[PDB]
Design a binder for these strands. Sequence first.
RNA 1: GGGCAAUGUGACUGCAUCAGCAGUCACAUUGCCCAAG
RNA 2: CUUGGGCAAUGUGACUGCUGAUGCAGUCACAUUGCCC
Lengths: 659, 647
Amino acid sequence: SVLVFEISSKMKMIEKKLEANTVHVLRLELDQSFILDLTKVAAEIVDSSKYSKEDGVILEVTVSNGRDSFLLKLPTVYPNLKLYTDGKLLNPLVEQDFGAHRKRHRIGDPHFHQNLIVTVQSRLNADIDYRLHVTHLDRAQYDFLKFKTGQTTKTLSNQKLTFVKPIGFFLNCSEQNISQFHVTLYSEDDICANLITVPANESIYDRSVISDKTHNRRVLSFTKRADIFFTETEISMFKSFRIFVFIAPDDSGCSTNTSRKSFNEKKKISFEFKKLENQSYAVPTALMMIFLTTPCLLFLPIVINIIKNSRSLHGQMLQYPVAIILPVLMHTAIEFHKWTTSTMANRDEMCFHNHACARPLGELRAWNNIITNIGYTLYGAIFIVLSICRRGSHVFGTYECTLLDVTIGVFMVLQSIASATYHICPSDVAFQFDTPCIQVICGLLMVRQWFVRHESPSPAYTNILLVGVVSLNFLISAFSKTSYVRFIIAVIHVIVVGSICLAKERSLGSEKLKTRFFIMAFSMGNFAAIVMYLTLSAFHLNQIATYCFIINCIMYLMYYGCMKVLHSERITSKAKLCGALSLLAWAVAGFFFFQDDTDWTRSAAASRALNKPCLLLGFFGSHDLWHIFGALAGLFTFIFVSFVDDDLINTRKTSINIF
Amino acid sequence: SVLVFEISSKMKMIEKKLEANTVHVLRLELDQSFILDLTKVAAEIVDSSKYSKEDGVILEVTVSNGRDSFLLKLPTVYPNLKLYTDGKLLNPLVEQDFHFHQNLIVTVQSRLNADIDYRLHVTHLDRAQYDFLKFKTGQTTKTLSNQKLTFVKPIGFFLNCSEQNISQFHVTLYSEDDICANLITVPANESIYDRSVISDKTHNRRVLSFTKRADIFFTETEISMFKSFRIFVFIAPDDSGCSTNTSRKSFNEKKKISFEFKKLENQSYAVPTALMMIFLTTPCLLFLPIVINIIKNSRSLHGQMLQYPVAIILPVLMHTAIEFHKWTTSTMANRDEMCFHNHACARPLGELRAWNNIITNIGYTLYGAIFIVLSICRRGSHVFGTYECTLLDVTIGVFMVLQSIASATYHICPSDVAFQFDTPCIQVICGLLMVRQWFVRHESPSPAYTNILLVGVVSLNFLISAFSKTSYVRFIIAVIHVIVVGSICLAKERSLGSEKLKTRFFIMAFSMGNFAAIVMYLTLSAFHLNQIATYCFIINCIMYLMYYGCMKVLHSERITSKAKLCGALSLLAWAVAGFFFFQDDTDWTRSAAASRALNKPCLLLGFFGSHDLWHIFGALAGLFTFIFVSFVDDDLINTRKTSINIF
RNA sequence: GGGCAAUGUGACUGCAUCAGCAGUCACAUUGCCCAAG
RNA sequence: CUUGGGCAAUGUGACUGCUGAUGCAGUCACAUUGCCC
Ligand SMILES: [Zn+2]
Ligand SMILES: [Zn+2]
């Protein structure tokens, strides 16, 4: 037999000893004062231990206030533990939901007032003691996202919170004239939590029909930061969004060492509700494009005048390996597919950007991290032209590095494609493909300088070079969770450097003039490197392949130069300038790349907790300066290796120092 | 002010009226006469059209009986329509729960300031279409015939495998009516409607929108993780996710459903597997007296191990590196909803839902390791005979070994991923056999011609898929097709001398061949989208070998008897090995549901299906059309490289 | 293994100083056509 | 032109209530001492 119990509009701690087979129905008269009042309820079970033998559902609270409802099927179950208390929210009433009026405070024609029905239950034949804990967030906090005229960012401060006391919000855009929205949730204390947004129509606790695919509800873990972004199209699709911030007891999905106060520790939180407006970065891009075209002055005094001094093809067109495109194009196709055919919230849930200052442009959330890759595809289409513009004669100078330079061009372009397709959704997918084209190019430069004084280098070496780089990258990715991955990299690195030493020795005859020093140099440098990335927790798994590859490239090129100067040939002054500039550009590219600070060895929240702010214009971060100066360094190294052996074009192909 | 209302067991259709700002709770005292009675409590809104102006929700019915509670926020809306009636189920009480009695609260609120009328049906299901999955001793199959399933009466099920001592379970639903439906199952302790934090990240509940068929496979690592399962089969209102149009969408119609509960036990198919390997080593009777005899009669490496293109592997070992990562990290219940096999012949093994479409992809990696050796061990005369095609036939080797990797993972489970990669490799093999027989009389054909052929196929394979959903894709496979075959015609006359007795009688074929194929697939919707690029290819190969098989004898050269019989079987294989491929019928255009309705029963031994055999016979034709082009000109072995014709 | 009293923490309800927010009643201005004198 | 009434919003203060911050006291939980039959 039910026992209705009127509740007071003022009391928030309702301790009632529920009898056996009795079903309380509390009741709270809602009036003009509860419009847009987030009503959060919270149950409990007193002396929880006494029921530790009975399993499943014990108590059942079913709050409801006419516009929404939910159930609390105590005691909740979790991947770790069972809790005997938990709170949920309610879609608050609105001004419409108990009628519009003029004056007189419900004059007397109608007498309308909603009501909040709190039900209780028990599956036990025995008696239970609960503690309902109804509270309220008034209109001052829910539906706080109304903006005044000439305002863009409203901000809370230290909004307290607790496992049994979450916070919501109500972003309505159509009724607010909003284009783009970007939330931000600071915090200080490492206590796991959950941000959750849902369009207004739609409800959180209710499961969907084939949900995991039909799911417009993002759910973001976070400890010290989380960010949202309501794109223009999502706004025009749903028109009104409910933000929530739940919070969890433990740190399972967040970390390993767990907080002590189980489901009891309050955690601070702030917010930032920005109201952006669409903007195309024409000024920030300006300084870039001009800065990526000042070094092109290195063609006017040299090459554009040589082409003026001159003013099978089917066979090479068919023998040039163009299945070297397929890795990067396949990965960019897969990535674009998985991006476009994803829900509008699975993007913000899955793409771990640097939402610190990842500047957006329409649908894309990090424009700078993308369009700064145009340095490459600008310094990529150059090489593919210079070579095919000055390919000749065949009796003086060294052999022609025509097709190898065309391949360095095709890969300087594929680098931009891979980078701008991985900086759309930087998730931990099986294949990284940000650096691997940089690695392939820093291999091709080595092969060019290895073969330039023997024969025309064939591009078919890019086949094994690419297979090596791609297999190594997939390997690093797939073994990232264990501990011996840096040992795998150490041993493969050793095998490669040893094979290179051997190929060196079996090409000349073990001359003490060159090999005795060269082998030693390589082995000591690369063993220093193996140490530096096998004992130090500052080389992540992403960067070790790139560092070893660019170090091999730099070392072999400096050795080429050292042997050219020891044999007493001339290195033109422009070549020395180009070499020094390539060295310092690679140095800058390093100093910037080293702060990638991205390792999928940690959980989601630990990766959203990182926020490295940008440096220039509020548009250039650190990874983007890497993207630029990598292209600069590639261009400078390429121009170097295309200039140092120019002064020998007046020497026969017989008296050339072979090495 | 609340209003209690007791209702005994005699009222099923409770009709009441709801005043302004009022709240009705009800109660139907339950006793031991209600245990294991799966109940459903639905609500409506009388005079529905009167409320068509109010936006949002009207009633909030919250049934609850202690053990199982849920909600009803009428009118539940759907992307096509708003239903003013909905019903849900209840986990019945357990015998342990039994002076003493359990009850059934039904709160009914109302946000509307005006009055509301409503009804309240209550229904029951037990003793059948529930608790029916109890197996007798030594019983592995239980069956139900023409079970009614109306929208007002969803069917329930309870599988308690722990007590039933089950290891692997299978569930099938044959039907006949073209009515949408839904099939959801959950772990015992879980509910159906209740979400939680990262619930989607633990969404162990499956949903198989099924028109005519649906299948449920309960693995060993599911049973051993939840130990008890709940099954339901609803009737979805609209045909959006399960069909195309609002054709007869307005209805609440009955539906007949069957079942077949098969309690499989894990095993290995030593009978049919071995009956295949011996089938793929008998047509190897050709290598008996010839290839291993020349070696006995016969009894740079540092550079060509570099100048060989090994970057042609990556288009596959990158793709399969993803179809795996997507198979492992996919939740244990997501695999039954994302992977659309052909469960009429998809015999399982260990974990995989299909081991008849994977272990028959060993006819390739077996016929692959032969071409890799019988070409390397068949070159040792370097001024006699045709040029040694012993580097190319390493690729045709590899691309017969790759094909047994891109395919035997596309048959792990075939999502509608961007790249199909079941045929692509076979397409290229039938390509190389052209480049080989082309350059066979001019120069040792460098394998680097794949670099331009691969990017050809993969692009034409990605181009197909991206525009698979649109209506004008088949016209794109006309312009891309015509362009290349036009060149391959033009590329001939610019090499031979435009001899009309040869060229004008060779362009006449590809003009008549490819065109006759275009209209065959451009006007007729029998060649599905994926199968056209392949049949385009294998024809270019066969024609270019009917030609090379003629231009040899047309120039009055003799062919050896072994090549006579070899090639004559290749035509027999490529003819039958098409007929089986001709029944794939996997068009990712149609809806998810109908893509499950396909069911082609096993052909032989209950382990060989139609699309299965295209994986075997695609290896015979892949072999006979290789031995052919390496034995066709053996008679010319005693003729100098100058006294030979050229074409 | 048990309870009591303290030590320190972590929650919790209601008093006291400040914040945004809702409602209540009264104030003041404004123009307004139709109606008439 | 003035009054009577109606509209509407601006902003005016008056009162009530909510939510978050610093202290104030007091209830509940966890670990160390002392005691006990
Ligand atoms: Zn990048
Ligand atoms: Zn297949």
